[PDB]
């Protein structure tokens, strides 16, 4: 049919079988780059705004303010434009001019914080703006807002169930906010009732999930896998539903993304390479060689044309 604005067209992304990964086609990828603003975050940008409207914490008067240097900023931007909200985003000077030209193009009130301060500097300034007029500003908080995993439970998960005819055995997904793996796992394990293996993927350079579950010292670090590796356990990561954690290094993630392009003709971002590299590893263990493995590919290549990818 016909969507009443762009936010309602989220999802229904396709499953594509890989030929040069896995074993005899047991690895399939879900291309989340085919979304209204071309990442998985389109789903949570839409539903966090929808939920805040249904809750009344977001009205025609109110203005969105958030701290995000990634795909969630673009997602909130396209949704705020599609639905008539003013929006302010904060971020460090670190950001590529193209990501800033994109956000200004979408009409964001960009507020730039100190580069050396980083992500914490951005979230600090956003909270001060929200302190100015709490009745005027709404922060949606992707790391904590349950509307984030809820939309994956209502769309991403069921799409995977339907398109595989219940045959999905494994879901592999990088963890940023954690909403994707949390929502998908809850839908397939709890609503459809199938005991799959939920595999979280994190950078080996910042393996805080592996370290936490192992009761080891939590040592966050810098990495190049944009979209994952927050360096902490997000509230929207439901640890209780995670069966397995795979770590991937930045160079392997980048090499795997280039292989997806050159060998599969799939234009995937760098966190897409990390998730596929973790999936290939499981898929070549005899214990998974007959299982159907579904891998989330969060974003598209051209988000990364001027980065280490090319």
């Amino acid at each position: 049919a016909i969507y009443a604005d762009n936010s309602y067209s989220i999802g229904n992304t396709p499953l594509v079988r890989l030929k040069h990964f896995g074993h005899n086609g047991n690895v399939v990828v879900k291309i989340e780059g085919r979304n209204p603003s071309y990442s998985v975050k389109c789903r949570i940008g839409a539903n966090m705004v929808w939920q805040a409207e249904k809750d009344g914490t977001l009205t025609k008067g109110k203005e969105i303010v958030d701290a995000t240097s990634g795909n969630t900023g673009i997602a909130l931007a396209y949704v705020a434009a599609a639905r008539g909200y003013k929006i302010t985003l904060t971020m460090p000077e670190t950001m590529s001019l193209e990501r800033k030209r994109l956000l200004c193009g979408l009409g964001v009130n960009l507020v730039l914080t100190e580069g050396a301060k980083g992500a914490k500097g951005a979230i600090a300034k956003a909270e001060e703006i929200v302190a100015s007029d709490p009745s005027r500003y709404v922060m949606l908080k992707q790391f904590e807002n349950p509307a984030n995993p809820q939309i994956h439970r209502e769309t991403t998960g069921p799409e995977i169930w339907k398109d595989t005819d219940g045959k999905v055995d494994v879901v592999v997904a990088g963890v940023g906010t954690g909403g994707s793996i949390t929502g998908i796992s809850r839908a397939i394990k709890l609503d459809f009732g199938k005991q799959i293996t939920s595999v979280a993927v994190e950078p080996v350079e910042s393996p805080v999930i592996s370290q936490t579950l192992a009761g080891e010292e939590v040592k966050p670090g810098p990495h190049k896998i944009q979209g994952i590796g927050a360096g902490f356990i997000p509230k929207n990561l439901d640890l209780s539903i995670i069966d397995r954690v795979e770590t991937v290094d930045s160079d392997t993630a980048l090499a795997t993304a280039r292989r997806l392009m050159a060998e599969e003709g799939i234009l995937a971002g760098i966190s897409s390479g990390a998730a596929v590299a973790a999936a290939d590893r499981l898929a070549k263990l005899p214990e998974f060689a007959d299982k159907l493995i579904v891998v989330i590919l969060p974003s598209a290549s051209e988000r990364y044309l001027s980065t280490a990818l090319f």
Binding site: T68, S69, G70, N71, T72, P92, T94, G118, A119, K120, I123, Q142, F143, G176, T177, S206, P220, G221, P222, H223, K224, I225, Q226, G227, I228, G229, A230, G231, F232
Partner: peptide, 8 residues
């Protein structure tokens, strides 16, 4: 390069 929720 990304840390502390940056890039998400």
């Amino acid at each position: 390069t990304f840390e502390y929720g940056d890039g998400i």
